[model samples]
Target: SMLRAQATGNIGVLVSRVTNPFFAGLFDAIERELHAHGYQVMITQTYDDPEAEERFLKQLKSRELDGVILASVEAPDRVMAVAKAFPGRVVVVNADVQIPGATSLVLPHYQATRDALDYLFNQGHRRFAYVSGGTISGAHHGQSRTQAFLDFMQAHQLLVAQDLLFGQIHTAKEGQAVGKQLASLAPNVRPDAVFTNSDEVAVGVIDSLLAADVKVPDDIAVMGYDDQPFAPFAKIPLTTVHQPVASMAAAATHELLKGLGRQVAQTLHLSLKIRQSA
Candidate 1:
């Protein structure tokens, strides 16, 4: 009866971007897991906007949710306020903006990027280029991943040109634009290896490079952060870091049920999915 009763509360999820395959997949997984537990899932897309996230959290509080899971596009303080105000009702997932007294489900980004870079570096890639996501005023994950890549290169004393590009939002179109720009910006410096923030961006980068008559893995190698579905389907299958979405989601829900009063924290490691791209 306890388990059955535990299954019946509405679980609210605030995601970063709905259009990106990574988030889309995450949402799907979360929905399935929540539904199986008999929880009604309330999903909201932040569109990577901090102000919208703040407003949504405020609105969510009024919904009297059994628990809340935040994708955390906003600052830790902003997110923490909601958790504090609604103590025992909100939990944050993914982006680990640690609140002094909140629950979190995090993914290991630094080590994952380090592993990816180390692999490429060992593959004799001295010249590297990174196509990153937007570093919005409030978004922390994008910036954290970009910094992790840079820190990895610096630690190894690698000489790679950082031709970082940002978009107003994350999407295949933005990825395409960044990919095309990278091609034009460094025709000669032509990165021997490229690292993008997501599979969508990687797809766009690979597409642009191929269309420009540049061969992948022959002329240059490409890799992406999230191991999205499209990565394996691309002409040159992409090498990527896998985020444990299902596990993370399950953990978030479990911790949220335990309530914010518990001050629980979890960090999951990002696993590498090797493929033809690298």
Candidate 2:
């Protein structure tokens, strides 16, 4: 990294949601890794808004950043433009799409969801439910964990019903709304186990389910992703997939340091965690 040492300028980062623990936690890790290597870091929260991300990337062109890491942005074209601007100096984190000009630290979402299903199914749960979102018309929707859950269910010949399908939203409030829908259904039609794309959503679902006086894992088991420290301390400790935040940040940093001499390993492993909820 002789080139890096001579300039050793600041690295810019765009985080999808500042308040979301996953982004915050991993950004800290990314910053630590980069700073340890003698680079300063600058970060802006995208607020989960594509336009905000687009604006940030446009603004960054004037900043003369040595490198940048994008945690997420829904608009692939905008992000791809950022990639074109920086070439080997850019990295994308956790987004489904990729740009030819940049490197990405992708997550193993399909294997992660499939592994979750296999665990729950082996626990004697047959009727599986999923909650995750990407719009039907959105670019990144199909690669989501919910889609993976659907694909896994189809492979095993398990049934999915409209009432059990929570789609097109990505918040805990949205999850609570869907959780209430399931709680209102007749016990016979309700699912045995449910999976949410995030722990925040799962916590919201847990809130509604508890308000309905239903027992988690006794009446219905639940699963969520991102294994936040917040999940285990929940009212009903959440079962979730560990996204390996530090590991992902470290790997992305590795890519940023190594440049385009070769294609680095982009996909990282996800681990299923056991807890009281499932």
Candidate 3:
């Protein structure tokens, strides 16, 4: 309890890539919340690197910062190691890991994926393609957009085409590469719809398709996740999943500020922001 006697007034926020619009927005919102409460914010990008993640955890465990908010959980072992070392000083977001003294703000990845899939399905899209940052096997428990897509396909007794499952897709550039591969396929064999893991990737998909003289929605519908700020400004307004970044940030900050108070985890659900692309 006496650890609170000398407040450090600093908080660290870690994410996979701050350049990703979703993380960019989340970091901004968190920064705003922490600033309002007189706490300085330090944001770090892990780029999904295990070493970098462990390095940051060490800093948190050593109390270089008062506390830490983990926005990425690519390596649970590293996170658990730090969480166990610095109880009540770590707050995890958008993941499904429960640590002894840490609180987590879990995102509804399953429902969000289903929201996109259900919309595409109702719109008569049977041949589906998905581009994701991670493979199904790499997805975390309770935070798997890939698993949701697979479950949807299984429920309808539809098999996802092996070629249509694009993985290791994170940036818009990777999305364009996926788009190029899709564009090479015969029109009849191409997917009727494509669901991307982020708005950046979806924009890339749309741009690549348009460059190849393919009409959006008319030829192949495209859906995106994490309806970022640029989602509406995309070539074709994106139909995407909306995560409440501001609200999530506020909740996360509130949880972290609780200090040694009762720690309880919460789940935030995402909604569909239907637009023109789909």
Candidate 4:
């Protein structure tokens, strides 16, 4: 007698932070798409903490999950271990760390940052300033983008000011503070242009500059990564690189479905969204 395979159980997804509108959209899109396929979904947030991710993975291990999608921030080893413990049943999205047996959905962080730099350089801006988040000691998204910017500037023989400031806010407020510091630099020492890691930071910087009576584009040009929804509505309309959230989510779900039946791995590149803030 032929026996039917057991029904697939719920899918678990872990992301770093959902408070940001960007991640919120990612979660919503992935859930909607997965639900259409009749798979119950479970979502968890690591709050950008590795320890939290580890605890969540431990909890997930006990769940009867058919598959998992992870957006990791740190200690990828633990997350990779979780995926291996359930071989062919986990997928990592947006972080780009490949763990031999698991699948990854990646954004073109390096290339996209490079593209933004190239665009600014082509516009005759030789000196650059970057406002980044977090420290370089960890596997942070901002670190990768910042490094790419540095590489591009070095390749072009541009002078990078040692005074580049990093913000602790991780929000718009931090951006504004950094903007004020940049504004105070001696005219010749000021960065001709700036690149920020997130739209929130960019908006903060712009807002601070405006409040300080500093003339944007005239005093200094600025750009940001991640073209979040409010970017275009900003006073000057931010120039930014847009992450392909929808496409990445759709592809991740498809890959998970494929992995359920057989071994598989796939990587997708995010496109750049260029706009007027440059």
The number of clashing residue pairs in each candidate reads: 0, 0, 0, 1
lDDT, candidate 4, 158-269, per-residue tens:
7667677564446787788888887777888877788887788888888877777777767777887777889889898988888877888888888887877633555555
Give the Å shift of residue 168 in candidate 3: 0.5
TM-score (C-alpha) between model 1 and the true structure = 0.85
lDDT head-to-head 1 vs 2, winner: 2
List the candidates ranked by TM-score, beginning with the highest.
Answer: 3, 4, 2, 1
Worst 10 residues of 4 by lDDT: 134-143
Candidate lDDT (C-alpha), each: 0.72, 0.78, 0.82, 0.75
By TM-score, the better pick of 1 and 2 is: 2
Q: How much lDDT does candidate 4 score?
A: 0.75
Model 4 misplacement above 4 A? 1-8, 137-143, 167-169, 261-269
Model 1, span 159-207: residue lDDT tens: 6453443535256676677667767764576678888778887888888
- Model 2 segments beyond 4 Å from truth? 1-8, 136-142, 260-267
Judge candidate 2 at residue 16 and give its lDDT: 69
Every model's TM-score: 0.85, 0.87, 0.92, 0.87
Model number with the top TM-score: 3
Instruction: Show the lowest summed lDDT stretch of 10 residues, model 3.
Output: 259-268
lDDT of 1: 0.72
Q: Candidate 3 — which residues are off by over 4 angstroms?
A: 1-5, 138-143, 260-267
lDDT of 3 at 25: 91
Q: At residue 125, what lDDT does model 4 achieve?
A: 81
